[PDB]
Amino acid sequence: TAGKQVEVEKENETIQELMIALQIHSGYTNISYTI
Amino acid sequence: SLILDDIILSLTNANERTPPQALKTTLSLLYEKSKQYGLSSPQLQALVRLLCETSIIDTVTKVYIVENCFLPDGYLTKELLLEIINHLGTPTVFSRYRIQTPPVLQSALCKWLVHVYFLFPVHSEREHNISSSIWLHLWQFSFLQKWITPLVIWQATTPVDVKPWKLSIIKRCAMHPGYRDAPGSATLILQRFQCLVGASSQITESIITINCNRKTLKSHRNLKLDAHFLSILKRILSRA
Amino acid sequence: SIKPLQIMDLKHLTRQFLNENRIILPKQTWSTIQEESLNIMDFLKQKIGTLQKQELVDSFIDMGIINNVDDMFELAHELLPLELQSRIESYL
Amino acid sequence: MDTEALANYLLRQLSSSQEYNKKLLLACGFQAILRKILLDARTRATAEGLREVYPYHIEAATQAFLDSQ
Amino acid sequence: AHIRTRKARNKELWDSLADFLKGYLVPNLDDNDESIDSLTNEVMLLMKRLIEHDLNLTLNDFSSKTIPIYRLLLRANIITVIENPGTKYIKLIDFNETS
């Protein structure tokens, strides 16, 4: 289904927002912009 | 100019054991030529990281260097905000071995970023999404709120930026005891979301749940911005 | 001497807690909590004036506030700002 | 007033890193008792079927606290 | 034609998350006396549990080895913890919703 490409786009979004929060609140010091 | 690198590269080698009058020379030499040629963005990156990792400069003189010599000669680099970002926060159970940087120095770095907001570089939109959430997360550090909230606000441009999960983060923090100013800073961010996406029931009723005297909000909306610093900066940016 | 603690300060330390439940305090109840904020502070000022490392929260379990130290962190999370939370975490 | 503010308030009427943290722990203890008391109060104000916590509920609950605990 | 760059991006986030766990987050746990891959899998499982919004995930799913993780999510304010049993379920806040 071409609507389940709208689902990987949504887990694409949460992994991204998840890492930012792990990195910041675990004192990571190599925070960048990953593709 | 090239002089501002033997300067900067020297401070890098300084430590305990250096003739402290040798130091004060190099600092004054820094205060001097920074006001003249201004600071080249890669130099500025090397400066800010020594400012956040070395012990051999009084912290209140660190603040002074940010308040009187952080004068960029153009647009800021993205690798520069990452260098600042990677030095903000609190020591955590995964990060106890970390060199952590005095909070006052931290917030002063932020206040400085507010002054040079117009020099921020262009972000790809994926990059803008990231940057928008970092500052919101950072916003929660009680001692960065005063100066983060302008950055989280000014980055709020399209109604894509304002989403529900950012709202509770904000609402949690406003209502949260153990924060003093957060209701002021929070309503602000909210009003900018209101002023941006339009109606949205969630936002408008959040603002109600946070009652602010209508006069802390007027002490929060107006910032003093140190005109002397932007004076010197306009001069630098004019020249080359 | 500022022994009676400000009403507006109470109405802030707790306004989230009240909203998060059912609690509707008129201004009259607010005064009542103020004078009681004294005898409740009165209580533990003689409870243990000894400031101990280990039994500090062990004292707190005895009071029926918590069951363990995990509960104390859940309290830190809801009463302290972010950066103190990371601190207290290592203290436990 | 915030929670750290409440910490120094408490200790000033009575009295280095490890002792700072306990001061904070103590400030959470005050609000923990205090909200136990307001929650006790709400239940006996809802026992009687009322909209609203009335003052007696408060001094009931506060002594209902210091007696048992 | 625009679909296999996002599925491309999707693996490059999964292994980025993985590489960050194996690389930084789990080593700074340093529990299980030295079981960095025995623990990474514990933790990796937990994150895909969170990311896929497994509703069966509860506080008891955290070993006393991995409980800081839980505390880290708690601090970051990016999970909701809710209890008929006296047990407590954990889900990620919603990052995709737009209303």
Residue numbers in the entry:
A (entry chain H): 147 to 181
B (entry chain I): 2 to 241
C (entry chain T): 269 to 360
D (entry chain W): 1 to 15, 36 to 89
E (entry chain K): 136 to 218, 222 to 237
Give passages from the manuscript:
The inner kinetochore constitutive centromere associated network (CCAN) complex assembles onto the centromere-specific Cenp-A nucleosome (Cenp-ANuc), thereby coupling the centromere to the microtubule-binding outer kinetochore. CCAN is a conserved 14–16 subunit complex composed of discrete modules.
The structure of the S. cerevisiae Cenp-HIKHead sub-module at 2.9 Å resolution is essentially identical to its counterpart in the thermophilic yeast. Cenp-HIKHead is assembled from the N-terminus of Cenp-IHead (residues 1–241) and the C-termini of Cenp-H (residues 147–181, Cenp-HHead) and Cenp-K (residues 136–237, Cenp-KHead). In interface 1, the C-terminal anti-parallel α-helices (H4 and H5) of the HFE of Cenp-T combine with H3 of Cenp-K to create a compact three helix bundle. Interface 1 is dominated by a network of electrostatic interactions involving Arg206 and Arg210 of Cenp-K and Asp338, Glu357 and Ser354 of Cenp-T. In interface 2, the conserved L5 loop (residues 177–182) of Cenp-IHead inserts into a cavity within the Cenp-TW dimer formed by the interface of H1 of the Cenp-T HFD, turn connecting H4-H5 of the Cenp-T HFE, and N-terminus of Cenp-W. His177Cenp-I in the L5 loop, a highly conserved residue, makes an important contribution by providing a C-terminal helix cap to H4 of Cenp-T. We fitted the Cenp-HIKHead-TW sub-module to the previously determined cryo-EM map of the S. cerevisiae CCAN–Cenp-ANuc complex. This showed that the HEAT repeat domain of Cenp-IHead and C-terminal HFD of Cenp-T of the Cenp-HIKHead-TW sub-module interact with the nucleosome DNA gyre at a site close to the Cenp-ANuc dyad axis.
